[PDB]
Chain length 192, copies 3
């Protein structure tokens, strides 16, 4: 019965494509609001990827954040900036890769997660996060620098709001086979 | 009568400036909606140029797209990404330069056009397109890389909606001397 | 009494950090509207920084602009583009550093200011401005080019509207220790 053997090699080809510099890097930012709704920003790009957004009061204030990267990211390149400290005394970013948890399904890394809560004394947060593809060629930009400039133009961004997390998991996470970690610490994703 | 000879050289100077790395690259994306209205995004920049936008239902759904580049683009560098296929199996872009038509006026290339229709089964499209200036120095980024970084900041974007294509051609295309191809396959533009 | 001597060295450390390539570059664009209100866009980033925005009629039309950079900028790298001249004959930017005034407090440069008025015959302006950190290493991008690509993702942008300039100075400029120059030519800022 050959049907099985071919399916196995075609998954190995997919992992090798995704780990090449033609594989995407994906990031998601989930903002958890006080009315129980969830706002998600997703950006997908080649070479590197980032999000920079302002999360303010809606129709309800944001209370926590979860940032998730695809497994192609180099966790050590992850950087995050946040604010709304005087400018004279500010650092440009922090390297937060050590705070990311591995999301696993069937013992396979499907993503990396950084969850943190926001102080109650706030109703707004401005936030930016950035990560680079883990391929060993990433810091060897001779591929051409202009290819990376084009990737900045071709990055696609998606933004959606859901009424509760259960709706997010059932109609956004599960049908799209995305990695996730919900309020009850249940893992989602599809191992290759 | 000298008035004529000078006018001719000053057009040759303009073409040579536009074909130098100080010439702009321009892109337009036209989205044709079901109520007959047209939405246009224009971006102009040095070295390279791109647009990334989401075209969703209005007050009416988008039905086709036309992408137009200025003649300074290198058609072989054009890349386009599109979506809303699972992420595990996605390619970052397609090279679509071969699908672009030359727009001509008086036998002179005034622009390059890619028109495609959208499936009826959709009411949204997310789309990004990118192109690089054709000057032979484009892939020789030693000009400095920081100059190209500044160009990303200085790119100007314009967005307008028109009630019908005739209004677009009469009050946007014709008075601004832009290249275009309308529903009846008529060409617009001004030869240098 | 040692309390004084330590405070002095810690200011010298701050200036040296800000003048290193880990110091931020900051830009502000103030748009002064006909009803006396003020719109401000602020962007802060590492290596280089820019803003590109469209200032159109509100609820009232914009009448003048003030652009302010932090002292870390190289004034000679400042570039500005502006419009809404035919595209065939356009330049990509002008170098406007010579038009910037030094803002000083206690004989110390706290910022650089370019103020200009808009023609009465307009109700809109599209505008982009860009500047590079003055550290001598800025044009030596071997730090890696990918670090500069990440900085583009991590830049944070802030946008606020105020009813009159007095409210801007009292609740935005003064409490945040920002450099400024008001309608009566009074200087604001905090010397290090």
């Amino acid at each position: 019965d050959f049907r099985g053997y071919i399916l196995s090699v075609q998954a190995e080809e997919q992992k090798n494509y995704n780990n090449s510099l033609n594989g995407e890097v994906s990031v998601w930012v989930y903002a958890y609001y006080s009315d129980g709704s969830v706002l998600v920003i997703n950006k997908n790009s080649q070479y590197k990827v980032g999000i920079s957004e302002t999360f303010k009061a809606l129709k309800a204030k944001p209370r926590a954040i979860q940032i998730i990267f695809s497994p192609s990211v180099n966790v050590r390149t992850i950087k995050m900036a946040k604010g709304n400290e005087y400018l004279q005394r500010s650092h440009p970013w922090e390297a937060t890769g050590i705070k990311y948890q591995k999301i696993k399904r069937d013992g396979e890394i499907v993503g990396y997660s950084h969850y943190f809560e926001l102080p109650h004394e706030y109703n707004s947060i401005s936030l930016a996060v950035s990560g680079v593809h883990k391929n060993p060629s990433s810091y060897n930009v001779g591929h051409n620098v202009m290819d990376v400039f084009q990737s900045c133009d071709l990055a696609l961004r998606f933004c959606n709001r859901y009424w509760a997390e259960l709706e997010l998991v059932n109609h956004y996470i599960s049908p799209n086979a995305y990695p996730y970690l919900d309020i009850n610490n249940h893992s989602y994703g599809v191992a290759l």
